[PDB]
Symmetry: D4
Subunit: 215 residues, 8 copies
């Protein structure tokens, strides 16, 4: 059996876009991209979900101590070995206005996460090798009707558009795999940030085909 | 389905005891207590595994920044809501010689984790409620033929015999559920620390019976 | 009775504007907005005052470790449960020149405080629920004849004009209550920052009307 | 009018002792020692309550960031100036097993708090003088029927018996006022830690007589 | 007798300007402003020198842990009580290119130091009162022939010109004394930063007049 | 002139022992050991006083951030170069009950300070060499009639008796100078900690004789 | 023999420029500038290599805790005394996009390292003197065909052109030696960052000529 | 060619024992164990010396920030790749009186260093594999004539005697190589801590045999 760890933010947790913006409920597994990917990959794969709303690549959020992805990823890797592949879809939250990050710095944060996977061989007391890495660039942001979300992501749209190219450059440099979500889907939720079930399913099917071919 | 997050150390990850002590392989899912519990609970339950070898309740390990359970649990809870129950089986590693913790301090560390579950309602932007908690006392340690493990757990056996009584008192105080694993299993692995497959399966079946009676 | 905690800066503490700028005396209770609110609400309400001159939403002041509102609020909430409502009037001091904060960052700091209220249920060992929240936008700044105050608030007037709209958006997003003080009062003190007794009393009466309609 | 700040733990917050140990409700104001003291002092005094369950003199609690009294007292003083007197009743929680503090270290923590009052003149931008200080030694602990509380306070009884003498020595040295609660009341709650309403009322009346005579 | 603490940077230590820029020797006491001030004041005054080359008001220097004035001043005050007056001449080093401080932030750092004096009453275990404060704005910088010093103070000249006005506003606001060194002297050393002996003597005489007028 | 920096605690600052223990006044210069030493050395020497009540060698005091000698000494050395000699009389406060330091640890803290002197050559931008070092063991403690001082120094008398032998061994190892004050004076103040004026003067005269023999 | 410590980044470690950018192999010693220098200096000299890919002067890299040169240099100096000369070639990595450092700040970081060498006399328990220092400006950057390297060094080329002039000014100020590598070599590797073997050898020969002229 | 990194304390740096204890000179390379090992191994081996007097396995020394071995080892590994073998001889300094470490904690600190080698594959941007590890238990301490050294190592002899057995157990557990220096040499220097030249040579020859047998 092959084990695949899916590390992400609200797009991976499965945030349902809603007209009142927040709070919201979670998509059932079969309507998450992770579940749709698992269905297409089949029973030879075991999918592990680690999606956290508002998670960044490598930034401490001023209002929530839980959100730095790089703080949690080493622990998660060691908890889930043996792993064949880690899929990482993050970066959208790094584009928020109050973080003042350049696109390159966001990609460099993704690079920190890739390095944490590449150096994780052995975990705590095992002979297991490092898994492969699939870097996923999230789809670009869209216009947002809610003024709080619009303020939250001020300046972020242009940054989100640059991530695909920079993540491709990063993945080539670090000799790992790459997939641009925006080549297959768009951000289609009413809030301009999150995704519909149908788009989650299309995304998971497409990632499944990438996974099946990358080993 | 009812979601059950299983938070623990190597006993939960599934460390196979071996003659060379370390390193070792992972039990397959159906030979882990988590998988055996999942099998007896049936398809109305969804099990989430968060087991990490060498994890403590609330201590920083001097050689490994991944191992403080309380550093990770809030992030894990928010990543996995909605949750109906969190089962926590930890404390054995707090008995290691170099931590110099009293049994009450170990139970108080378990209490820190219980509190993190009880106050987690809402996660990141959801209306979901806090789950129930099942505190599990691990079975006492056993003779260790490897001198490195014997030094690692110097003074720990006597502390391990006190955890069950103190965890019961904690659980009554905090108004959560409690299971004494040592009434049903013993630490039967060749290394004096870990468990056989047959014992994992017995444990998981016993925990499943306890969980079913809560719902 | 219904308990109302009033969390704020000098506008809440009751700084009397004076020709020498500083130091100054405190308005008596019946000339504070808190006391005037208490008088119009009547004996079914119990007011708790937590006003601190120079307090910010969520910033460490370089000269004074007492001034980060978010450092203190969780302790204050647990000390005063049971609470029915928390009124927060802060943000003016975040506009000071040496903080270099954008208006969105100031509102996001207010959001940190709102979240601290919303997640405070139980306090230390109680069954009490989280109180409601009333976010109050302070009135915009005014001309400052003292050159030290003018330097202190350089760039702050323009930011102060944006807080009301952003606080309304925050409150709608977090599903709490909102009052724009600038619809009812102006910053009428001689120093361009603080308020007259007549204006405090008008503010408190207006807030009282808002509070009564919540219960 | 004279203003009196009452800084304390669950004995000041007003924890009702209950057979299930925890959680519990709060005494109404007239059944707290603060309220009973205010009734006896009369309308020439304004009492300010700052009681926090589980609060220590100057220790960080491993499971709760809210509980170090010395972290909060400077902020509270500046928020409540002008003050004529600060009454401090703390130390019981410093005797808990997991803190491993000697009686002298507990008294030295009380001394830290006394110094914070004595040096607080001016607050933020006022001409107000430092208030007087009344150090109150809490009554000694009693036997505890609940095993979690008994473990929590292991070794604490003897420490609690030494605080009166050491706090008297401290108050004489620092030239402030002293009152031994144990000379008037005993710890009479079922849990061995907290107080009955009748004892709260006796205590507040006795502190009121001390206050009226100390200026 | 009355004691006067002189807290400063190289202008107070007595750096002799030299063509090679650095290193250099110290002026003898009678050619320092402190010694010249002491001579004019007479033997009714005890002068304490605390001058440190490269010292800032309140900034940590990246290359030298000794240079934050506000880190050392509280210790120095307590070491030198009883004190009648503290003279503070700092701010020039805050204008260095790599600190990126605005003039207001520099004056606010001076304000931090003024506050440390005003709150220092008692020291460690004494009845002594807080000293008075004389804020001294240093003379503006001059053109600098050495390229390393020119880079070191890039952007600093304009900032140094603004300190007099801002320090005057600060001293009025905090109700302390003020003296503009630039009303009496100029920066006349060959390096564009430090002062000649005759200028130190003129400066010390003028400061002595200010000190004598206060007492 | 030869410059001599005197770095110490209350014995150097000049704490007057008094019947009420604290607070107290400072001995005049002529009644300090520093001033008595200066008089006997004469006008070829320049004495710099750096005495701070309650100062330790290298410990952070829980109640006062001013008191770690090793935190302040590097800044003080650079402020006072050129220096021919640093006299260090510290260690008594390290024997306080709440520090739990062994006598060797106290001498090792003295060693930290000696090293700071030996490595201080050049200061900030000077060619000056490192000064010589005179390590002074303070006299042992004596009976303490005040219960607060008795508790403060519990266990400390026996440690104070060992400092001289250990400081001699330190000074020989580090190749610096050593004077045992306890051969010439005893702790004669009423409080069992501090010194009479007559004893200060005898100490300073004895240290002066030692200093002169070094040059 | 005369001992020469060579402290640097990938230019010193010997990164082989390659078409796929990363990862890469290390030049053999004979193809490193260090080994080429050693050969030309001959057997009267002993070369110590301390080159680390990605090392900065004095910056913490967000992704790698190994890379701050100033964190490691004091330990390295004490490990290798006696030393006659330290050659430092660093600064290129400080020009990376995500550090946002000005050229003067980069030279000031070099200055931090120079100071660490100049103040290292004695090491741990030795009489050895501080070595001489040779500051080496690296050659300017060149076109970078890999998009990841291009982003990594955005803004850096222009900064790299200013380092030589600033390092010369630093070395004159601090009274140490200076060599401009860009007078003798250019950045000739395919990646626009690293060097060919022929260029390493030419550099080492030119540095050897400089070193010999110092002794 | 194969590269061998020698990571150690004064026994590796080459401290010459001397009657005055300290300071002292360094043995020439051919009288160090490293140089003697290199001579026996031949020119197919490249030896890298990283010895630092007073270095510990994993402890911060109170008086010197340079001495934690585990702080420096990751940087040194990355600087010296490609490496075939890392030889680690440390632990003697962890036995010093003021560290209060148990023998197991010392061996666990060695374990931290072993783990840093085993996880170092790649360094910064290379394909190189992790080196092998040779753990060397240092020879036990001897009686020490100097009282400062005797105090420094109080309690340490017994601890030093236990390191061989514990390091053997550690090396077996971690599956690396082990050599007991005390099976071949004794601590023969006059100070009871360091070694003679002939003993360094015998030690290096015996370690070379171990190294050659591995390859």
């Amino acid at each position: 059996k092959r084990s695949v760890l899916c590390f992400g933010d609200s797009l991976t947790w499965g945030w349902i876009p809603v007209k009142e913006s927040s709070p919201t409920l979670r998509y059932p597994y079969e309507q998450r991209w992770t579940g749709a990917m698992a269905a297409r990959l089949g029973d030879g794969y075991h999918i592990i979900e680690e999606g956290l709303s508002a998670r960044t690549t490598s930034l401490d959020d001023p209002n929530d101590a839980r959100l730095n992805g790089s703080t949690y990823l080493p622990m998660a890797l060691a908890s889930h070995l043996p792993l064949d592949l880690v899929i990482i879809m993050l970066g959208t939250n790094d584009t928020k206005s109050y973080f003042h990050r350049t696109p390159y710095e966001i990609a460099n944060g993704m690079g920190k996460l890739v390095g944490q996977v590449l150096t994780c061989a052995g975990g705590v007391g095992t002979p297991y090798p490092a898994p492969k890495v699939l870097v996923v660039a999230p789809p670009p942001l869209a216009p947002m009707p809610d003024p709080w979300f619009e303020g939250m992501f001020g300046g972020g749209y242009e940054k989100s558009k640059e991530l695909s190219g920079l993540y491709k450059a990063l993945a080539d440099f670090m000799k790992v795999e790459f997939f641009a979500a925006g080549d297959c889907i768009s951000t289609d939720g009413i809030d301009g940030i999150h995704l519909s079930a149908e788009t989650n399913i299309r995304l998971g099917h497409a990632i499944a085909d990438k996974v099946a071919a990358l080993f």
